[PDB]
Predict the structure of ATPase ASNA1 homolog.
Amino acid sequence: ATYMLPSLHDILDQHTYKWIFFGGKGGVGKTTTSSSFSVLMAETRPNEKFLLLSTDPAHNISDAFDQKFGKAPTQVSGIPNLYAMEVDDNDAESKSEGDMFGGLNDLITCASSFIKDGTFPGMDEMWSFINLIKLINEYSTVIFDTAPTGHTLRFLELPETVNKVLEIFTRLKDNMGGMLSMVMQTMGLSQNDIFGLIDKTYPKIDVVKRISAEFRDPSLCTFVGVCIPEFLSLYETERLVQRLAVLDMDCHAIVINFVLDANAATPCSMCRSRARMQNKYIDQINELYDDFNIVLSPLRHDEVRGIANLRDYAETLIKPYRFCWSAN
Amino acid sequence: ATYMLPSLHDILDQHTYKWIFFGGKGGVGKTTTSSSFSVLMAETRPNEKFLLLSTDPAHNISDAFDQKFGKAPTQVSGIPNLYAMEVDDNDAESKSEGDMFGGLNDLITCASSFIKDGTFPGMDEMWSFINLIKLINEYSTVIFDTAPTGHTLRFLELPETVNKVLEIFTRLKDNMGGMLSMVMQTMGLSQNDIFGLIDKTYPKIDVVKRISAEFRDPSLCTFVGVCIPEFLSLYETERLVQRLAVLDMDCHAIVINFVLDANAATPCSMCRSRARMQNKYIDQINELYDDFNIVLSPLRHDEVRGIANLRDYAETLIKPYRFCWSAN
Ligand SMILES: [Zn+2]
């Protein structure tokens, strides 16, 4: 057994990556793992530039580094080549460009109603990603820290939506099922305005399609699961691994956090039992994900705050920590 | 603060109850709480008879008591007046009666297709409950241990389904929208067979409606939530409490299991941190569910097995355990 090494060295070594996602439902020290990895990845390659991108509304990355971040990418104090921002002049571009994506959103809703059986995903989920691409210096790799709750695959289901947006585009320009005429009547727009709107938006729909196709490429993009030795935490990563499989997303790495370093030899009786409780859930992962890199991160007394402790935490991601149940 | 007592004494005292449910997603020692409470409730009222009913497919109650159980209710060795069974001669009744509920299931599917917009819940979920009522000696109270995963409110959404079954019944006998004629043609049945089938089944649909209305009565039925001090465990009981609210189900009691009895004074550093981690999640419950009885059950070294330990565990459900952070 233990075919795969319990380390994130393969991912740190492989410099071909551009997008590294970090997903994990609940409080599993995900933002610690997301932050610490970015630091480690930055100081190991001091020549190349890197981005840390959080979709967490609680701004847990700013508390991890002990430094506030905004929508604009800001250099991390003490770690150059590492920039951090918070997702969810340029306001003048937003008004003019937002008008078209307003008009598009109107055109797809109208066009959908003539075919789509009471169904329409918003263009905001796509428009949000189209804004994100505009602010991507030239960073060697971008590290994604997904939301801890709600819908955490918001950017990873775009290729499903574009396919329907491009379906509408073909049906309009071919005038299939008399959709072009029905849209021209309802919205009161000219054929030049409709073909005009398709022309201006399509290029930005194409870069999304192509960038979303890079996520499906395992040499360009990888996903790292984060969890804890607890029943519900397993169940959530079971679904996540199955959800990335149907999306053609690569996941071969999982980080178990808050692992209690204790066994039968531990004098503390209360620790011996909590270790037995964890062993049951850590084994399941080993048996189930035998083709994954399963990284075990020890329990720390104080929660990780500052570049100093992030760097210290990061040691156990690449150099596997020697627990008591480790033979050597 | 602490308006409500951290005990299940109100529920043990109130003998007016007939149905006590125990719900809790994941491994939160739910079957320990379900078992131990039944034992405590049985030995406090030695005159009256009680039932312990598990819908868990893993048969975790049989391992808790250390005694196998079947579909038939079996007396617990050392605790008379307490019977335990596993849900999910009499086979001769099942064939003859199953034919009608086969015919009904056929009639509702057929009738639904003429109105219900591609929608039909199965009659098996109801038929399963109709079988359960037949085996309800005269037990003073029945203690329900719901499934730990999947759909754990299977019996508690029957009043939604019967309303539609009774909707079909009215529409048929009134011949509204020409449904009676359409059913008589498709299934090739006589008006006497349809009105004949309604007549034989309705009484059993009525006892379900009335028994399901007793669940909504807070003096006859109550729900007890079970969870652990962990992020995902909270989130799951948040949904459960909100789901029981829309169903008009009474829940004013929650049992937090595997509570580590440690604080700043605890010599063990590894225990001090795991106590700080738990404090964050235990407080949320106190702030949020200020109108609920929040019971704190201490962490035990060995998992509960046998009537001896169930009885010992049950002490801390009624007499609140003195933790270190308890002033006295
Ligand atoms: Zn300890």
